[PDB]
Every structure is written in structure tokens, then in C-alpha cells.
Amino acid sequence: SSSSLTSETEWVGYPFRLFDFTACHQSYSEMSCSYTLALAHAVWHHSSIGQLSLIPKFLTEALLPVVKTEFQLLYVYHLVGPFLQRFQQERTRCMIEIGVAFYDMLLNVDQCSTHLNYMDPICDFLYHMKYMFTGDSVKEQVEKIICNLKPALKLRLRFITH
Amino acid sequence: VNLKQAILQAWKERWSDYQWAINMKKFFPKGATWDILNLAEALLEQAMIGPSPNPLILSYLKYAISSQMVSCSSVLTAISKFDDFSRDLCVQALLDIMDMFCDRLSCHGKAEECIGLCRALLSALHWLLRCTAASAERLQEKQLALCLQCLEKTLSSTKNRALLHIAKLEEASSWTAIEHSLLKLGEILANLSNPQLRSQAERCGTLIRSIPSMLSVHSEQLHKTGFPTIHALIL
Amino acid sequence: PNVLQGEVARLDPKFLVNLDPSHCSNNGTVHLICKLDDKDLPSVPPLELSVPADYPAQSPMWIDRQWQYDANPFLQSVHRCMTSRLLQLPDKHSVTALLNTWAQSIHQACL
């Protein structure tokens, strides 16, 4: 998350092709950050029994003051996205913690940013994450959090108030 | 010549402006020609009255433009040296009439008159440039803003920009004259008159300078993706 | 559609219809430009795009209403009474009925 990745970001900027693995089908797009994402995917997958209970404290203690830009939030999303269903299987508690952690990272990047360009898929990502995983449980926690956002993100996520 | 006498007679009796069309179609064969016709009327009454509102003849001209090629009216208001008269009232009233042209459309000609409407629009833009140059004096308001407003309305994107592009390819001397006039107008566009003034004039200048280059220049971006085409062609 | 041809044949020499850039091969089959050339004052031609010529419907299109009618005071009064009169025709017919109604309204609101 901090190799440089932020200031020297690159003309590489385009996230969605970079983060996801199997981009190393060609000899190209073999960025060393994608390797770690794929390895973390594999580890969290085969270890998806009890070692996943360390991810909420990990996020809400370590990942907060190490994120300023938006593709860092996108990397965190590509890390802790697919395993949300594995969590919802039985570990229904940490769901709200991961959700409020995502909301806090969203606020942290919105408060420090010039333009939010790659946020359009993020809106519907969060939409479906609330729609098919949580429901109305994170509502009391996110009502006072979503309001501190930008007018664009506010107009987008307006429908969350229901 | 009979049209002048007909117009004087129509002035001697204040018509209801709908019987005027009937009387004009009756006095003339109504089918002989319409390009040997009213295209010379508009100037007489208004430009001649000069310092005067000149009522209901602008209304007769309006009901004329209701059924008339815009090319003739435009080349009329262009060939006329109204800015030489400089009553600051006749041109001010004529701008409101000219507003009706670019607002709705510049109708077809159904013939080779396409070049005619093209020349008409080009000369109309030149006359609007002369309007701005003559009205930007403000040595001591209304005209300096209204002329710019009518110019912006005439330079409506995607409709008349193609017409002006065709005009440039038709001949280049008029475009060079328009460029010289745009430079002369930018010379005064630096005069601090108001916040709104000297602000949209830059937009009009950018539009005029974009006219010749291209209307559909591929300026699109943000197509971030991988190109396998060159990757395979080099292989 | 031959049914429309019959009406264009039955038209008076005062009326004259034509075709614009036509989305009218066989289904719409019409959106004409009928100039009411007559003795009285002229006006702006309407479109009058009609349905299949079997006519379980009428024509009225009202395309150039926006700029043509609002611009003039007389043309504004032309539209006014003419709309109310067209809202009375029970199952009006494409060419003859609607065109005659338009001419009658144009020369009646003329007063």
C-alpha cells in the first residue's frame, strides 16, 4: 500500500486492469503489487476458517492512517471484497466492522482528494454490498458518516438513506 | 418600382398586418417571382426613418420572414451600412428582429441557393463583428451587451458552425477579413467595462477560431485500456 | 398507400402537398408540407404525419408549433382557435378533412 503507489502513481493509473490477477496471462502486466493481491486472495481463501477473525482489527487499526488516495481504497476493496460472503456465512459480527471501515476509508479519501474519477463503480459496489450482505444493520452507524462526504458522492449514495 | 408605391400606399393606411399579406399577394402576380421582390423593402422605412422606432413596418417585415428565404433578409441587413448611420436606436431595434433568425433556424433553399445562405450567414457574422466594434465605445450599458448576446446566439454550436466552415472553403478573403476584424475586436476586448462584458467575448473568439480548424476533431480521451493491436502487429 | 393517393387527387388547386426527408416508405407513408396558397393571408405549413392509410386514426402532427406560432401575434391566434376546433372533429381524415379544417381556422381567426 505504500511502496510508492501514490505520488509516483503512474500513467499506470488505471486500477481495474492492474489489481486483478490473471492479467499475468501475458508476460506483461506482471506488476509486483498484483502478485501480493493474488497471494492474499489464495491465503484468505484456503485459510477461510478462523484466521479471518484478524482482518477487522487489522483494517480498523493499521489500514486507517496509511490511506490517502482512492486506488489505495480500491486495493483494500479488491482485498476484502470476495470474502464478505465467507464472513456472512457464520461470522455475521465483523461484517458491520468491515463496512464501517470501508466507510471511514471512503471519508478519509474524500476529505483529501482533488477529483474522484474512479468512484462510479465504487458507488454500485457499496450499493450491492449493503443490498445482499448487510441490509439495514449498518444504517445507524453510517447515517452520521455518509453526511461528511462530497456533494457528488452524496447525490450518488442518496438512496442509501432507505 | 411598383413595390415602392405599394409600400407607400400601405403606409398611407394603417393595415391590420394580416390584410397586408393578402394585399401584397393581390397587387403582385403572386407567382411571378419572390426573388424580384420584398428583399429590398426592409431597408427603406426603418433605415430611412433613422432616429425613430418606425412601427408596424418591422412587423410587416416579421410577417415577411414568416414566409421568406432568410438569405435575402440577411444579405440585405449585411449590405446595408447601418453602423455608418450609427443611430444607436435603429440597429438596437433591428437586433431584436435578427434574433428571430438564428433562434429558430436558417431554412433550406431546395436548390443551389445553399451557397446563397452560406454567404448570407458569413456576411451577417461580419456585420455583427462591425456591430461589436462600433458599440464597444462606452466612452461615457445596453448595446455592448445586446450585440454580444446576438453574436453568441448566432454562433450556436452544431448548427451554424458547419455553415461557416463551408463558407471558409467557399472563399478565403472574407475569412481573412473576419480574422482581421476579430483581432480589432480583441483589441477592445481588453477594455475593462464590466464583469460579464469582455468575458463571453473570449468565448465567441474561441468559437470563431475553432470554426476553421474542425468541428469533429477527435479530442476524446480517458480510453484507458490495453492495446493488443500494436502488440500483435509488432510481433 | 393508394388511399392517400385518392385524397391527394381530390385536393383543390389551392392546396399542394409534398414530401420532406421521408420516414414514410410504407408505414407512416406521409409527413407532408402543405402550403395553404389561397386568396387570403398565407401561413406556415404543417407536417400532418398520418398513420396507415386505412385510417383508423387521423393525421395531426403539430411539429413546427414551437417557434413558428409563438413568434407572431397573428400566428399565435391562428393556433389558438384551430386547436380547439381540431379537438372537435370525430375521427378526422388525413388530407381533405384536416387540411380544410386548417384553412377554415386560418381564415376564421383572421376575422
Coordinates of C-alpha atoms in Angstrom, one line a residue:
Chain A
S1 CA 0.0 0.0 0.0
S2 CA 3.0 2.3 0.4
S3 CA 5.8 1.2 -1.9
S4 CA 5.3 4.4 -3.7
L5 CA 2.0 3.7 -5.4
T6 CA 0.5 7.1 -4.5
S7 CA 2.7 10.1 -5.6
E8 CA 4.6 8.3 -8.3
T9 CA 1.3 6.5 -9.1
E10 CA 2.0 6.4 -12.8
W11 CA 0.4 6.7 -16.2
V12 CA -0.4 3.1 -14.9
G13 CA -3.2 4.8 -13.0
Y14 CA -6.0 2.6 -14.4
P15 CA -6.7 0.4 -11.4
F16 CA -9.2 -2.3 -12.5
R17 CA -6.8 -3.9 -15.0
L18 CA -3.9 -3.8 -12.6
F19 CA -5.2 -5.1 -9.3
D20 CA -7.0 -8.3 -10.6
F21 CA -4.7 -11.2 -11.3
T22 CA -4.9 -13.4 -14.5
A23 CA -3.7 -10.2 -16.0
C24 CA -0.4 -12.1 -15.9
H25 CA -1.6 -14.2 -18.8
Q26 CA 0.7 -12.3 -21.0
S27 CA 4.3 -11.7 -19.8
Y28 CA 3.1 -8.1 -19.4
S29 CA 1.1 -6.6 -16.5
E30 CA 3.1 -8.6 -14.1
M31 CA 3.3 -5.8 -11.5
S32 CA 4.6 -6.9 -8.2
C33 CA 1.6 -5.5 -6.4
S34 CA -0.8 -7.8 -8.2
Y35 CA 1.2 -10.8 -7.1
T36 CA 0.6 -9.9 -3.4
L37 CA -3.1 -9.4 -4.1
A38 CA -3.4 -12.8 -5.7
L39 CA -1.4 -14.4 -2.9
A40 CA -3.6 -12.7 -0.2
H41 CA -6.7 -14.0 -2.1
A42 CA -5.3 -17.5 -2.1
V43 CA -4.3 -17.4 1.6
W44 CA -7.6 -15.9 2.8
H45 CA -9.4 -18.5 0.7
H46 CA -7.7 -21.6 1.9
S47 CA -7.5 -20.3 5.5
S48 CA -11.2 -19.2 5.5
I49 CA -11.9 -21.0 8.7
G50 CA -10.7 -19.0 11.7
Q51 CA -7.8 -16.8 10.7
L52 CA -10.2 -14.4 9.1
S53 CA -11.1 -13.0 12.5
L54 CA -7.9 -10.9 12.5
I55 CA -9.0 -8.8 9.4
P56 CA -11.4 -6.4 11.3
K57 CA -8.8 -5.3 13.9
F58 CA -6.2 -5.3 11.1
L59 CA -8.3 -2.8 9.0
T60 CA -9.6 -0.6 11.8
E61 CA -6.2 -0.3 13.5
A62 CA -3.5 -0.4 10.8
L63 CA -5.1 0.5 7.4
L64 CA -6.6 3.8 8.5
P65 CA -3.6 6.2 8.7
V66 CA -1.9 4.6 5.6
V67 CA -4.6 5.5 3.1
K68 CA -5.0 9.0 1.5
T69 CA -5.7 8.4 -2.2
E70 CA -8.5 6.4 -3.9
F71 CA -6.8 3.5 -5.6
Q72 CA -5.5 2.5 -2.2
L73 CA -9.2 2.2 -1.2
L74 CA -9.7 0.2 -4.4
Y75 CA -6.9 -2.1 -3.4
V76 CA -8.4 -2.6 0.0
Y77 CA -11.7 -3.4 -1.8
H78 CA -10.1 -5.9 -4.1
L79 CA -8.6 -7.5 -0.9
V80 CA -11.6 -7.7 1.3
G81 CA -14.4 -7.9 -1.3
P82 CA -15.0 -11.6 -2.2
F83 CA -14.5 -12.9 1.3
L84 CA -17.5 -10.9 2.5
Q85 CA -19.8 -13.8 1.8
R86 CA -17.4 -16.2 3.6
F87 CA -17.8 -13.8 6.6
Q88 CA -21.6 -13.6 6.3
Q89 CA -21.7 -17.4 6.3
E90 CA -21.3 -17.5 10.1
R91 CA -19.2 -14.5 11.2
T92 CA -22.1 -12.0 11.0
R93 CA -20.4 -9.7 13.6
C94 CA -17.3 -8.5 11.7
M95 CA -19.5 -7.6 8.7
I96 CA -20.5 -4.3 10.2
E97 CA -17.0 -3.6 11.3
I98 CA -15.6 -4.1 7.8
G99 CA -18.5 -2.0 6.4
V100 CA -17.8 1.0 8.7
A101 CA -14.1 0.6 8.0
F102 CA -14.8 0.9 4.3
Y103 CA -17.0 3.9 5.0
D104 CA -14.2 5.5 7.1
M105 CA -11.6 4.9 4.4
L106 CA -14.1 6.5 1.9
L107 CA -14.4 9.6 4.1
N108 CA -10.6 9.7 4.6
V109 CA -10.0 9.7 0.8
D110 CA -12.9 12.1 0.1
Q111 CA -11.5 14.6 2.6
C112 CA -8.1 14.6 0.9
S113 CA -8.6 14.4 -2.9
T114 CA -8.8 16.8 -5.9
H115 CA -11.2 14.8 -8.2
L116 CA -12.9 11.4 -7.6
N117 CA -13.0 9.8 -11.1
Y118 CA -13.0 6.1 -10.4
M119 CA -15.7 6.3 -7.8
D120 CA -18.7 5.4 -10.1
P121 CA -18.1 1.6 -9.8
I122 CA -17.4 2.1 -6.1
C123 CA -20.9 3.5 -5.6
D124 CA -22.7 0.4 -7.0
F125 CA -20.1 -1.8 -5.3
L126 CA -21.2 -0.4 -1.9
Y127 CA -24.8 -0.5 -3.1
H128 CA -24.7 -4.2 -3.7
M129 CA -22.6 -4.8 -0.6
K130 CA -25.3 -3.2 1.5
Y131 CA -28.1 -4.8 -0.5
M132 CA -27.2 -8.5 -0.5
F133 CA -24.9 -8.7 2.6
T134 CA -25.9 -6.3 5.4
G135 CA -29.4 -4.9 4.9
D136 CA -30.3 -2.2 7.4
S137 CA -27.9 -3.1 10.2
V138 CA -25.1 -0.6 9.4
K139 CA -27.7 2.2 9.0
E140 CA -27.4 3.8 12.4
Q141 CA -23.6 3.8 12.2
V142 CA -23.4 5.1 8.6
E143 CA -26.1 7.8 8.8
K144 CA -23.7 10.2 10.6
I145 CA -20.8 9.1 8.5
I146 CA -22.2 9.5 5.0
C147 CA -23.1 13.1 5.5
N148 CA -19.5 14.3 5.8
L149 CA -18.9 13.3 2.1
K150 CA -18.7 15.4 -1.0
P151 CA -21.8 16.6 -2.9
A152 CA -21.2 14.2 -5.8
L153 CA -20.9 11.2 -3.6
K154 CA -23.8 12.4 -1.6
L155 CA -26.1 12.7 -4.6
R156 CA -24.9 9.3 -5.7
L157 CA -25.4 7.4 -2.4
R158 CA -28.6 9.4 -1.6
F159 CA -30.6 6.1 -1.9
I160 CA -28.7 4.6 1.0
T161 CA -30.9 6.5 3.4
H162 CA -33.7 3.9 2.8
Chain B
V1 CA -40.9 50.1 -59.0
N2 CA -44.5 49.3 -58.2
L3 CA -43.4 47.8 -54.9
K4 CA -42.3 51.2 -53.6
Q5 CA -45.7 52.7 -54.5
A6 CA -47.4 49.7 -52.9
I7 CA -45.4 50.2 -49.7
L8 CA -46.2 53.9 -49.6
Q9 CA -49.9 53.1 -50.1
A10 CA -49.8 50.5 -47.3
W11 CA -48.2 53.2 -45.2
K12 CA -51.0 55.7 -46.0
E13 CA -53.5 53.2 -44.4
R14 CA -52.5 51.5 -41.1
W15 CA -53.2 47.9 -42.0
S16 CA -54.1 45.1 -39.6
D17 CA -50.9 43.4 -40.7
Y18 CA -52.8 40.3 -41.8
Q19 CA -54.6 42.1 -44.7
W20 CA -51.2 43.3 -45.7
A21 CA -50.1 39.9 -46.9
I22 CA -53.3 39.5 -48.9
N23 CA -53.0 42.9 -50.5
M24 CA -49.4 42.2 -51.4
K25 CA -50.2 38.9 -52.9
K26 CA -53.0 40.6 -54.9
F27 CA -51.1 43.6 -56.1
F28 CA -48.2 41.4 -57.4
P29 CA -49.0 38.3 -59.5
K30 CA -48.3 36.1 -56.5
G31 CA -46.3 33.5 -58.5
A32 CA -44.2 35.7 -60.9
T33 CA -41.2 35.8 -58.5
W34 CA -40.3 36.4 -54.9
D35 CA -36.6 36.9 -55.6
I36 CA -37.6 40.0 -57.6
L37 CA -39.5 41.2 -54.6
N38 CA -39.6 42.3 -50.9
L39 CA -35.9 41.7 -50.5
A40 CA -35.4 45.4 -50.9
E41 CA -38.2 46.7 -48.7
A42 CA -36.9 46.4 -45.2
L43 CA -34.2 49.0 -45.6
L44 CA -36.4 51.8 -46.9
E45 CA -38.7 52.6 -44.0
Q46 CA -36.5 51.7 -41.0
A47 CA -33.1 52.9 -42.2
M48 CA -34.7 56.0 -43.7
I49 CA -36.7 57.0 -40.6
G50 CA -33.4 56.7 -38.8
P51 CA -33.9 58.2 -35.3
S52 CA -37.4 56.7 -34.9
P53 CA -39.0 53.5 -33.8
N54 CA -40.7 53.1 -37.2
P55 CA -43.6 51.0 -36.1
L56 CA -45.5 48.2 -37.9
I57 CA -43.1 48.1 -40.8
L58 CA -40.8 45.9 -38.7
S59 CA -44.0 43.9 -38.1
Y60 CA -44.6 43.7 -41.8
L61 CA -41.0 42.5 -42.1
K62 CA -41.7 39.9 -39.4
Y63 CA -44.7 38.6 -41.3
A64 CA -42.5 38.6 -44.3
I65 CA -39.8 36.4 -42.6
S66 CA -42.7 34.2 -41.7
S67 CA -42.7 33.2 -45.3
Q68 CA -39.4 34.2 -47.0
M69 CA -35.9 32.9 -47.5
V70 CA -33.6 34.1 -44.7
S71 CA -30.7 34.5 -47.2
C72 CA -32.3 37.6 -48.8
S73 CA -33.0 39.3 -45.5
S74 CA -29.6 38.5 -44.2
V75 CA -27.7 39.8 -47.3
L76 CA -29.9 42.9 -47.0
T77 CA -29.1 43.7 -43.4
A78 CA -25.5 42.9 -44.3
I79 CA -25.0 45.0 -47.5
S80 CA -26.5 47.9 -45.6
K81 CA -24.1 50.3 -43.9
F82 CA -26.2 50.6 -40.8
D83 CA -23.2 51.1 -38.5
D84 CA -22.3 54.1 -40.7
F85 CA -25.6 55.6 -39.7
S86 CA -25.0 54.8 -36.0
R87 CA -28.3 56.0 -34.6
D88 CA -27.8 53.5 -31.7
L89 CA -31.5 53.0 -31.8
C90 CA -32.4 51.6 -35.3
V91 CA -29.7 48.9 -35.1
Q92 CA -30.8 48.3 -31.5
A93 CA -34.3 47.6 -32.7
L94 CA -33.1 45.6 -35.7
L95 CA -31.1 43.3 -33.5
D96 CA -34.4 42.1 -31.9
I97 CA -35.7 41.2 -35.4
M98 CA -32.4 39.5 -36.3
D99 CA -32.8 37.4 -33.1
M100 CA -35.7 35.5 -34.7
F101 CA -33.4 34.2 -37.5
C102 CA -30.7 32.3 -35.6
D103 CA -33.0 31.3 -32.8
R104 CA -35.3 29.0 -34.8
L105 CA -33.2 28.1 -37.9
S106 CA -31.8 29.1 -41.3
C107 CA -34.3 27.3 -43.6
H108 CA -33.4 25.4 -46.7
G109 CA -33.3 26.7 -50.3
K110 CA -34.2 23.4 -52.1
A111 CA -31.8 24.4 -54.9
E112 CA -28.2 25.7 -55.4
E113 CA -29.1 28.5 -53.1
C114 CA -27.1 26.7 -50.4
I115 CA -24.1 28.9 -51.3
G116 CA -26.5 31.9 -51.0
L117 CA -27.5 31.2 -47.4
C118 CA -23.8 30.5 -46.7
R119 CA -22.7 33.9 -48.0
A120 CA -25.7 35.4 -46.1
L121 CA -24.6 33.9 -42.7
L122 CA -21.0 34.9 -43.3
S123 CA -21.8 38.5 -44.1
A124 CA -24.2 38.5 -41.1
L125 CA -21.4 37.4 -38.8
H126 CA -19.2 40.2 -40.4
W127 CA -21.9 42.7 -39.8
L128 CA -22.2 41.5 -36.2
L129 CA -18.4 42.0 -35.8
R130 CA -18.8 45.5 -37.1
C131 CA -21.7 46.0 -34.6
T132 CA -19.5 45.0 -31.7
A133 CA -16.6 47.2 -32.9
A134 CA -19.0 50.2 -33.2
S135 CA -20.9 49.6 -30.0
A136 CA -17.9 48.9 -27.7
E137 CA -17.2 52.6 -27.4
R138 CA -18.8 53.2 -24.0
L139 CA -16.8 56.4 -23.6
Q140 CA -19.3 57.8 -21.1
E141 CA -24.8 49.7 -20.9
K142 CA -27.2 48.1 -23.4
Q143 CA -25.8 47.8 -26.9
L144 CA -22.4 46.5 -25.8
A145 CA -24.2 43.6 -24.2
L146 CA -27.0 43.0 -26.7
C147 CA -24.7 42.8 -29.7
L148 CA -22.6 40.3 -27.9
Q149 CA -25.7 38.3 -26.9
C150 CA -26.9 38.3 -30.5
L151 CA -23.5 37.2 -31.7
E152 CA -23.4 34.3 -29.2
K153 CA -26.9 33.3 -30.3
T154 CA -25.9 33.3 -33.9
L155 CA -22.8 31.2 -33.1
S156 CA -24.9 28.3 -31.8
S157 CA -22.8 25.2 -31.9
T158 CA -23.5 22.2 -34.2
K159 CA -25.9 24.3 -36.4
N160 CA -24.2 27.2 -38.0
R161 CA -20.6 26.2 -37.3
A162 CA -20.8 23.8 -40.3
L163 CA -22.3 26.7 -42.4
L164 CA -19.3 28.9 -41.5
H165 CA -16.9 26.1 -42.2
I166 CA -18.5 25.7 -45.7
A167 CA -18.2 29.4 -46.1
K168 CA -14.5 29.4 -45.4
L169 CA -13.9 26.7 -48.0
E170 CA -16.0 28.7 -50.5
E171 CA -13.7 31.7 -50.3
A172 CA -10.8 32.8 -48.0
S173 CA -10.7 36.6 -48.5
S174 CA -13.8 37.0 -46.4
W175 CA -12.3 34.7 -43.7
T176 CA -9.1 36.8 -43.6
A177 CA -11.2 39.9 -43.3
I178 CA -13.2 38.3 -40.4
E179 CA -9.9 37.4 -38.7
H180 CA -8.6 40.9 -39.0
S181 CA -12.0 42.1 -37.6
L182 CA -11.7 39.6 -34.7
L183 CA -8.2 41.0 -33.9
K184 CA -9.5 44.5 -34.0
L185 CA -12.4 43.5 -31.7
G186 CA -10.0 41.7 -29.3
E187 CA -8.0 45.0 -29.2
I188 CA -11.1 46.5 -27.4
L189 CA -12.0 43.2 -25.6
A190 CA -9.2 44.1 -23.1
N191 CA -11.1 47.3 -22.1
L192 CA -12.4 46.8 -18.5
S193 CA -16.1 47.6 -19.0
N194 CA -18.0 45.1 -16.8
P195 CA -17.6 41.5 -15.4
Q196 CA -20.0 39.9 -17.9
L197 CA -18.6 42.1 -20.8
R198 CA -15.2 41.2 -22.1
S199 CA -15.8 37.7 -20.7
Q200 CA -18.1 36.0 -23.1
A201 CA -16.3 37.8 -25.9
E202 CA -13.4 35.4 -25.3
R203 CA -15.8 32.5 -25.8
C204 CA -17.0 34.0 -29.1
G205 CA -13.4 34.5 -30.2
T206 CA -12.6 30.9 -29.3
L207 CA -15.6 29.7 -31.3
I208 CA -14.6 31.8 -34.3
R209 CA -11.1 30.4 -34.1
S210 CA -12.4 26.8 -33.8
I211 CA -14.7 27.3 -36.8
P212 CA -11.8 26.8 -39.4
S213 CA -9.9 24.0 -37.6
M214 CA -12.6 21.3 -37.3
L215 CA -16.0 20.6 -35.8
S216 CA -15.5 16.9 -35.1
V217 CA -11.8 16.9 -34.1
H218 CA -11.1 13.7 -32.2
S219 CA -10.4 15.3 -28.8
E220 CA -11.9 12.4 -26.8
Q221 CA -9.8 10.9 -24.0
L222 CA -10.0 8.6 -21.0
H223 CA -9.9 5.4 -23.1
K224 CA -7.5 3.8 -20.7
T225 CA -7.1 0.1 -21.6
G226 CA -4.7 -2.3 -23.3
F227 CA -4.0 -2.2 -27.0
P228 CA -3.4 -5.7 -28.3
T229 CA -3.4 -4.4 -31.9
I230 CA 0.1 -2.9 -31.9
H231 CA 1.3 -5.6 -29.5
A232 CA 0.4 -8.2 -32.2
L233 CA 1.4 -6.2 -35.2
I234 CA 4.9 -5.8 -33.9
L235 CA 5.1 -9.5 -33.1
Chain C
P1 CA -50.7 3.6 -49.9
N2 CA -53.3 4.2 -52.6
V3 CA -55.9 5.5 -50.2
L4 CA -53.7 8.6 -49.6
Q5 CA -53.3 9.0 -53.4
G6 CA -57.1 9.3 -53.7
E7 CA -57.1 12.2 -51.3
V8 CA -54.1 13.9 -52.9
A9 CA -56.1 13.6 -56.2
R10 CA -59.3 15.0 -54.6
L11 CA -57.4 18.1 -53.3
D12 CA -58.2 21.6 -54.6
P13 CA -55.7 23.6 -56.6
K14 CA -55.4 25.9 -53.7
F15 CA -53.7 23.2 -51.6
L16 CA -50.5 21.5 -52.5
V17 CA -48.7 18.8 -50.6
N18 CA -45.2 17.3 -50.9
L19 CA -42.7 15.1 -49.1
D20 CA -39.8 16.1 -46.7
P21 CA -36.9 13.8 -45.8
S22 CA -39.2 10.8 -45.5
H23 CA -39.5 8.2 -42.9
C24 CA -42.6 7.3 -44.9
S25 CA -41.7 4.3 -47.2
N26 CA -44.9 2.2 -46.4
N27 CA -45.9 2.5 -42.7
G28 CA -46.2 6.2 -41.9
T29 CA -46.3 6.9 -45.6
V30 CA -46.7 10.6 -45.1
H31 CA -45.4 13.7 -43.3
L32 CA -46.1 16.4 -45.9
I33 CA -45.6 20.1 -46.3
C34 CA -48.9 21.6 -47.3
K35 CA -48.8 25.3 -48.1
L36 CA -52.3 26.8 -48.0
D37 CA -51.8 29.0 -51.0
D38 CA -55.1 30.8 -51.3
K39 CA -56.6 34.3 -51.7
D40 CA -56.2 35.3 -48.1
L41 CA -53.1 35.7 -46.0
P42 CA -50.6 32.8 -46.1
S43 CA -49.1 30.9 -43.1
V44 CA -46.6 28.3 -42.1
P45 CA -47.1 24.7 -43.5
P46 CA -47.7 21.9 -41.0
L47 CA -46.3 18.3 -41.2
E48 CA -49.5 16.2 -40.7
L49 CA -47.9 12.8 -40.4
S50 CA -50.7 10.2 -40.7
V51 CA -51.0 6.5 -39.8
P52 CA -51.5 3.7 -42.3
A53 CA -54.0 4.9 -45.0
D54 CA -56.7 2.5 -43.8
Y55 CA -57.3 5.4 -41.4
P56 CA -58.5 4.1 -38.0
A57 CA -56.9 7.4 -36.9
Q58 CA -56.2 10.9 -38.0
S59 CA -53.1 12.9 -39.1
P60 CA -52.3 15.8 -36.7
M61 CA -48.6 16.1 -36.1
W62 CA -48.0 19.7 -34.9
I63 CA -44.3 19.8 -35.3
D64 CA -43.3 23.4 -36.0
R65 CA -45.6 24.7 -33.3
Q66 CA -42.7 25.8 -31.1
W67 CA -41.0 28.7 -32.9
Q68 CA -43.5 29.4 -35.8
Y69 CA -46.6 30.2 -33.7
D70 CA -45.1 32.0 -30.7
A71 CA -43.1 34.4 -32.9
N72 CA -46.0 36.1 -34.4
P73 CA -49.1 37.7 -32.8
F74 CA -51.5 36.7 -35.7
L75 CA -49.9 33.2 -35.9
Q76 CA -50.4 32.8 -32.2
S77 CA -54.2 33.5 -32.5
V78 CA -54.2 31.1 -35.5
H79 CA -53.1 28.2 -33.4
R80 CA -55.5 29.0 -30.5
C81 CA -58.9 28.6 -32.1
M82 CA -57.6 25.9 -34.5
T83 CA -56.6 23.6 -31.7
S84 CA -60.0 23.9 -30.1
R85 CA -61.6 23.2 -33.5
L86 CA -59.5 20.2 -34.2
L87 CA -60.4 18.8 -30.7
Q88 CA -63.9 18.5 -32.1
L89 CA -63.5 16.5 -35.3
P90 CA -64.7 13.0 -34.6
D91 CA -62.2 10.7 -36.3
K92 CA -60.9 13.3 -38.7
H93 CA -59.5 12.2 -42.1
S94 CA -55.9 12.8 -43.2
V95 CA -55.8 15.2 -46.2
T96 CA -59.1 16.6 -47.1
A97 CA -60.7 16.9 -43.6
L98 CA -57.7 18.2 -41.7
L99 CA -56.5 20.5 -44.5
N100 CA -59.9 22.1 -44.9
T101 CA -60.2 22.5 -41.1
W102 CA -56.8 24.2 -41.1
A103 CA -57.7 26.5 -43.9
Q104 CA -61.1 27.4 -42.3
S105 CA -59.5 28.1 -39.0
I106 CA -56.7 30.2 -40.6
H107 CA -59.3 32.3 -42.5
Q108 CA -61.7 32.5 -39.5
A109 CA -59.2 33.6 -36.8
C110 CA -58.2 36.1 -39.4
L111 CA -61.5 37.8 -38.6

